[PDB]
Amino acid sequence: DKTENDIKALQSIGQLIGEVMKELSEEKYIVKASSGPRYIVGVRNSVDRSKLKKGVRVTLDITTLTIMRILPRETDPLVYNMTSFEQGEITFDGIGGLTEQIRELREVIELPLKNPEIFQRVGIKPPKGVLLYGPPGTGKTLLAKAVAATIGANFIFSPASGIVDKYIGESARIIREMFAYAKEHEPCIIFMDEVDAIGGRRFSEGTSADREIQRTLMELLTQMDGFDNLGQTKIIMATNRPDTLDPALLRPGRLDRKVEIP
Amino acid sequence: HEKVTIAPLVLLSALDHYERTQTKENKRCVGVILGDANSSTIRVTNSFALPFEEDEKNSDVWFLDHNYIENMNEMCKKINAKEKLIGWYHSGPKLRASDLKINELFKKYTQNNPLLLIVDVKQQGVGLPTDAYVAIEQEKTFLHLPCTIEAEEAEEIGVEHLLRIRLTNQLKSLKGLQSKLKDVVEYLDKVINKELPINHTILGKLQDVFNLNNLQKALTVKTNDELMVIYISNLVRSIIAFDDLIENKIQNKKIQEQRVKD
Amino acid sequence: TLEPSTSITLAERQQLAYDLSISALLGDKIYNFGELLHHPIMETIVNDSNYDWLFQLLNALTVGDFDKFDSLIKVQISKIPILAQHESFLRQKICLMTLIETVFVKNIRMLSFEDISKATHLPKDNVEHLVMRAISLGLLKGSIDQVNELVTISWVQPRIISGDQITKMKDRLVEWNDQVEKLGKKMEAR
Amino acid sequence: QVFDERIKFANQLHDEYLVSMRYPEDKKTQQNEK
Amino acid sequence: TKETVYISSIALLKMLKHGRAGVPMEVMGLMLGEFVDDYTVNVVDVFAMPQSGTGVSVEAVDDVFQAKMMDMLKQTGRDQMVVGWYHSHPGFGCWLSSVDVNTQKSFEQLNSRAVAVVVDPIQSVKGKVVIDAFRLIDTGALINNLEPRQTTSNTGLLNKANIQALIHGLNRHYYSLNIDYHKTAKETKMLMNLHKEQWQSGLKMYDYEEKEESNLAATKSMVKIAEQYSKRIEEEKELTEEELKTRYVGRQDPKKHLSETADETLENNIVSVLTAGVNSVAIK
Amino acid sequence: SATSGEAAALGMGLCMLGTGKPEAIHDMFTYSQETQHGNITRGLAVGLALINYGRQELADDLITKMLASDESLLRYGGAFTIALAYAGTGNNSAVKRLLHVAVSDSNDDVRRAAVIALGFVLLRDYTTVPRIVQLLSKSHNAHVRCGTAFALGIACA
């Protein structure tokens, strides 16, 4: 049966995956293909038209261009960026000696992710971003693994130079991902590792193709000021020195927490 | 209960091999079907005949070779692997001990209940030349599932190219009115008068239609309120009939213009 | 209905029918006591020694006299009021099903508290509260009218009896016979 | 009762326009034109 | 003359069903029948063939699978000599077969009547089914045989023939594509009782009621919604022509609202009879 | 025979011109339903038309069988069967039957064969021939326009 199921698995065909853009009619929908073209697709009796509306990722057909099945919504399923590969090594007792600054982080991180009603009773909004800086060699890299060894929630590691891969519209889309997955995967914590790049003013010498990085900074600034519900998701951004970061971010309204590790 | 959906390709393909074998009325052809019986709607995407031999003077005589069935299943795995044996069909109007006893023979190679089919070669009466029958172990009785005819987009139009308003649509209404008359009178007169069969099990379902001029005279007072929508339809239609005079008056300018040019 | 299964002697058939009798006394579900008549139950027993309770309740529904059946039974089943309550329900269920097709040929749906009063041998005050009890048990769907003294109830549950509705099912199709001419000829002429 | 006459009255004006065109066209189409 | 294959109703759908899986995915099959050269060609039964590592090719034919299928069809009376092979090629769409070129030359050694039926645009069916066969002309230089006799030849007007890239020469020495269908007495009554335009058979009064019942809230809406759009078009283009002289300079405007509202006035009369007719006709 | 099989029906049809042999009508018609050919069945339709020449209403029995049959080749010869039997003196019912075939039937070869048969019935009056074929020449069918093209030049030659 295992060998016969191999032929049965090869009899199946491919299925196109796309997201619904606009609803043309009851049986007529407009779904954008993953390659970027759009088509008017039909419906079947095996799917529910209530979940076929806009903002929901569906499955199309590669032959007749029709809706076949329904899949859960995943923007760009890159797991290595979503999973942080947690292996417990260093805990809060291994980062000790920083306790003056350790008890400072747990109040704006562990407390709002546990009992959020404390900040709601006073009326203050929970802090979004937290800045961890200091001299090199103080364990700022270990701060990501120490906090992650306790809460045990999801953690998204997003290196600076790993997301700068040159593509059309992809550089600004990667930031949109982490805030889009934060609703379905729970707010948890999003981590940024040693970003010296996007925080620059970037006077124009020709920029040498780096204009794709400029829209990356614009997406990060508009996200904090966006109308979407935020404040539950924590943004941990670490860097060697703060001045290289965007002064628009350092000012209040986006990054409310500057935590020094001297 | 369940449902049955058979494409028109399966129905006519079963009739072809009947004449190709020069099968007279004394003999009948038996074959197998393929599809997906797992869901509530049984779909038949394929059919194959079998060398069935039967004596006309004895209903206990039949010839069924499973080696041809075992080979047929192996030949289909190289064509369509998604298809499995969902049952078997047969020809001829009559049901005798030949087709009744073999229903358990196909059960060995069929996971679901084999779906019995009577293929009418002469197509006598109404629609549906083939009827889908299912058997129960609890007493055995042949029940007909809501068999329907449906195919894909290219399969439905494909037979339309090979074959190639309001008054015509009303012609089929009278044919359905006589169907109500001729089915009840012929059946009810058989149960009553001479030769009473064992009944009152079916009578409960028959009179279940008559309770709800077959329906209700208690709403006659309320019917006039339901007829109001029909009277409303004539309110606009009186102007719609006058809307034809709009173009009729505009077209008067054309001929009047022709007299000027002449 | 199964002849081969459950093969028992003649003496055990009367004991099995006794359990079938006492089971239907305390509930109205699954038709009535007349259901076992067509089944090989009442025909396989004897009409004496208090085995006729199923036959006595057949005509007792139309006559509507509880004292006839109460005198032929013992103190065991007569000390529970449920026997008298559900027995009167089956008497009304026959009349409640007369609103659609039983007697009236015109299929006019109407019922009055005076007609059910003579059938159930109860005054006008008791029949008003008695109809609600039959509807609340899931027998039939409908309402009543106290102002005009009218009862409006549809027909759902089938019965085992035949011969009352056989003539009407053909008579209702006679009205369809006169409708084949006028609309059949005028439609083909278009 | 009134709407049944309006349909007949509308089609009556239709029947009047139904057949009148060719009358001036008999002379011009049969004769030679430039 | 040439070889024009007359395909039955069942044999035509089965070849489209075998190549139904995937646009790029390619399959193959085998044709059977008994006919004569010169003109009329028939196809009794067809069945798909397995796909080898080369996809569609001459070595993809399995004699073991072919011999077993002929034995299964021999008991059903469909056993016939091998008249050719049919193939469904991927979604390239330039010219027909994307692989097989000289394989038909090797097919001529086994049978001289062998043809290759290929549907180029995968599955496209709207008003017609486009299928394409092949006939090897061998040497088409001088004095071989006359193709333009049988039926519908000398095509290729200007540069437009079929996909329009073939023009005159087509594949090899103008194989002169011709295909026609046929129907028997049993296939004629089958299609009339099953599929003509839509399938209304098997049940009568439900198609009338269910169309109205699902449209109950819609019909009252559609009569009202289309009521606005009917006059809104009449209140725009019709205002151009008013007096005997020219005012708004109407050109095609008086003809726009006439053709668009011609069916609207017709649909209102159709739904008026349907809504009144279903509730009419007895039913107390 | 796929080659000389057509000359058999054409050769026998020329001998049966006029009243002909009534037995040869049903014999040649039976062989058309038995053998399905490309030239034989169409050739037999021409032979059955030649034997019906001059019979007028006497050929209405065979014409009914050709009009009721769904075969494309049998309907092709059914139009000229009316043309030959009704040739010479015309008939108002003969034109009515030919005009009904060129409309309801969707076969382009039969529509072309039906409009050509109109000229042979209308040979007597050639004044009404150009008026009828001009109305049919305004349709969207090319075979009807091509059929009425030569059908006009028959009686007007």
Place this chain on the structure above:
Amino acid sequence: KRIQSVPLVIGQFLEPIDQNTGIVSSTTGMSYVVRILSTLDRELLKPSMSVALHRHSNALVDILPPDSDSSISVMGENEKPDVTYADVGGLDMQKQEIREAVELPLVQADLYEQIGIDPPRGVLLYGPPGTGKTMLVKAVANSTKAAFIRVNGSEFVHKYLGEGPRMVRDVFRLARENAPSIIFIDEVDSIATKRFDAQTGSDREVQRILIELLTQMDGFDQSTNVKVIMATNRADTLDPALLRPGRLDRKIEFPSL
């Protein structure tokens, strides 16, 4: 008419050529020259109107209704009744110029016709980074209960080049079609530049976004219903062509200090 049916390809009209013949732009990125279906007309469409195309031949079939992608399609009200203008005070200096270049034309558009003064089409927000806001701009749409469209500067560029200019024409079009709306663009400085455009060049063109912003701005803003609001930062570099009175007028700087 029923041949094409559902399997239609999204496209957009470009320029007319011949009677019942026009060139369009398919979402696949290949512009073909095809004809127009006989039931339609060139006068029934618009240069920015979207049409349906065939799968293979890509022939024009049906005119699409006034709807498109426009990144995430917003009807103008999503959870809008939340914050009002009273939540952020001290803006009376800035709000005075905003209400006269937004609130007044959104309510009564006939007041500007009676004064014969051209109302400002666009609105800009100056000031150094960190201006906050994202309150009063939403509060105007909350108090007036009008339509609101928010498209960030990084959302104008689709993953494909040719789709970029097709989506920009749809942003300004969807606002005028249904109800008076307000177009908000956050950080548009990534497009509008001063003579450094495309950072001294990038990719292939990248200038297709700026071309449509300048062209489509003059085509719309007529009935004095939809207004354009763009908040930026200070690069000390701005496009003077956008600031011309024939395109954008209202210029508002944040009351710093």
Place this chain on the structure above:
Amino acid sequence: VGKAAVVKTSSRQTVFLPMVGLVDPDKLKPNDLVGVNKDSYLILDTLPSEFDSRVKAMEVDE
């Protein structure tokens, strides 16, 4: 729900496919390059012991 793998082609096209018996869910890794079909795009070949590639300049010298 069922086990199913989603593949992203090198042409930037997302294709959905059911679980193939030739591979196992434990062997299949996310964001991994595996041999796929040209037509059906089904997963057939496994990972050839290399994550992505050596790009341009790499020294395998021992």
Place this chain on the structure above:
Amino acid sequence: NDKVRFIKDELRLLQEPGSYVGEVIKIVSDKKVLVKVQPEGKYIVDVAKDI
């Protein structure tokens, strides 16, 4: 008859694959013209016999 024939004649025009768009660059005496297609590259094609 003219409306059905017109719709039928316009049906084969929509079924035609259509045509690309381009601009003439240079011409020679060989009847070969260089047409620059915007999405595609530059292609040297032969002129029609009517022009």
Place this chain on the structure above:
Amino acid sequence: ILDKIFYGVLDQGNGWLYVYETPNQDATYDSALELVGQLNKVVDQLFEKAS
């Protein structure tokens, strides 16, 4: 009641009350504009065409 706040009608003679639904009309805009809009343009199609 006259201010379209509470919809109902009373009885002055017997001191009773009656039931009055909130809508006084059901989809009047349908035939309202269909009528007067037709009466305006039914004459507008003639003018001097009769002279």
